[PDB]
Amino acid sequence: MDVNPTLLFLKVPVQNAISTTFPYTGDPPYSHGTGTGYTMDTVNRTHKYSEKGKWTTNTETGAPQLNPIDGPLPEDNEPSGYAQTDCVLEAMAFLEESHPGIFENSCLETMEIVQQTRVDKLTQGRQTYDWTLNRNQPAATALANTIEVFRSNGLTANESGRLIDFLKDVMDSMDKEEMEITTHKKKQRLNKRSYLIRALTLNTMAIATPGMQIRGFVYFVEALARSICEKLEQSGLPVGGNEKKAKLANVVRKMMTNSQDTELSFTITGDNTKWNENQNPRMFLAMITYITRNQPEWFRNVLSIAPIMFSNKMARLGKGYMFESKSMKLRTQVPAEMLANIDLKYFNKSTREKIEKIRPLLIDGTASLSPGMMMGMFNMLSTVLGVSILNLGQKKYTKTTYWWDGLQSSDDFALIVNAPNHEGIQAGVDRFYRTCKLVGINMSKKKSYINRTGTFEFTSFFYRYGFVANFSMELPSFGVSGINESADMSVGVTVIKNNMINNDLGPATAQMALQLFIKDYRYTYRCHRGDTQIQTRRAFELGKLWEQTRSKAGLLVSDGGPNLYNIRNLHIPEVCLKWELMDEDYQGRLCNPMNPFVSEYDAVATTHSWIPK
């Protein structure tokens, strides 16, 4: 009598109606999760999980460092960052044994790209921290400023245009005692410690964005990790949709069908939330050194620079804080540079406690965070570690009646464990839990569940009895990209086609997307169909065209003609789709090369393609 959509599941199995539980399917308008207190809590938790790790004082940045590796083994189920180097190396060795040569081929096939990439490759990317201006900036302008400053400071080897040359230039600049920054004329002298702390910065508006001196090394290490993952089957990256869908079915078939009827199989789905706390750059450096065994030393240095630099990473602290006095109706803002020495009476209990915890780390308005990682820079290496842990589960390594396998993608994991009895299943799951704890892999027991094999999910790819329900992508914008008629039409139709091909977009939904596309395009460009009664200035001349043409379907949609696109015919260019139907006189007028208007996407060079003023 009163609506209750959840009750739909009372007859429909949940896996079918999973889209019911995705409230947004878009980008919300609030942007909750960025600021300063979040950084405070992140640093505090990172250093808390390493509570018993050894403390030391850095010699270059002059900031404390925490090393939890090889620390005491955890005694409780709470998260532990005590990852043992020997266990990690043994796991990597076992992975190599099961997949001989993998690291060798990865290294030798990546050396070329290490020696081939150009400087401009760094231009592509997300926002970057500009040490020159001390604020997040576009990658291209940051690169221009960096080359300008280095040229001023007499470091012009990067002029060769090779990425490795620029990395050597960065090394030389970092070795220099001090440098000059000229802003427009204001000159700033950054000493060795100042420049070093700036270069190891992690700005926070991939939540964290490193500086520019660390881009190339991160790129190289991620390239090696991707190359290693490619040969790995359990790795969930960098495959697309269809292959990811097939991975789940293949794993289930391998684990279940081969097993005897007597044997019992179970599957656990688990989420590794807050996955960067317990993984340290030092363990990554260890695995990197292991990977490049018996390899040229220059390549080893280039590849190991990244985790070495990250282990001394400095984390910036938001923009600051905002205080308000209701009594006097006043508002003020304080920066993070003054948060080191300031009263704690303004803040509340939790905020003042966090400030108390993080006070002894703020160096020059930038906390020091050696342990733990930051989101979205070394994801592939984490996937490599996960697949190694999984590979350690074969029947030969386990040396037990039970066994297990599964998939890991560094954000979600699924594990199928089978054994002759229920006690066998319990033993298998417990042993996997402990083994993954030893390496520092943390399984959240409050967001994981176990059930008989057949039904589970992984990276939102919900799986039920051989059926996958990929929901890992959001719907893009079906609007006017704002270049020109033909350009916008082509890019948008290609966008919808591509989303149909891979992102698993239903046909009917694609049809409504095309409908809304046509609506928005006509509204924006004021090119409405001649038959429609809508009125505008452009409709006058447009109307004339509708009368002149002998074939309505020949006219381009931008010219007021009908939209003949559909699921079957989406890849064809709009101009080419109406080539024959277009009247000969219209064809000649439209594509006249001598037009005065003209002095990626697939489109024809018609007169409708102009550059906006």
Binding site: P507, P562, Y565
Partner: protein, 51 residues
């Protein structure tokens, strides 16, 4: 929510045209889309959307 799920008496959303359907899958897609649209085009939710 109850009143947001009731059936209104106006055409709140107007959508433009597309090409013809030749493939049987295109026929299925058009059938599904048309059925759903005829169902929801008179719902208050569309009124809220347009407002």
């Amino acid at each position: 929510f109850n009143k947001a799920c009731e059936l209104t008496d106006s055409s709140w959303v107007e959508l433009d045209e597309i090409g013809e359907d030749v493939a049987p899958i295109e026929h299925i897609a058009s059938m599904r889309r048309n059925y759903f649209t005829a169902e929801v085009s008179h719902c208050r939710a569309t009124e809220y959307i347009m407002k």
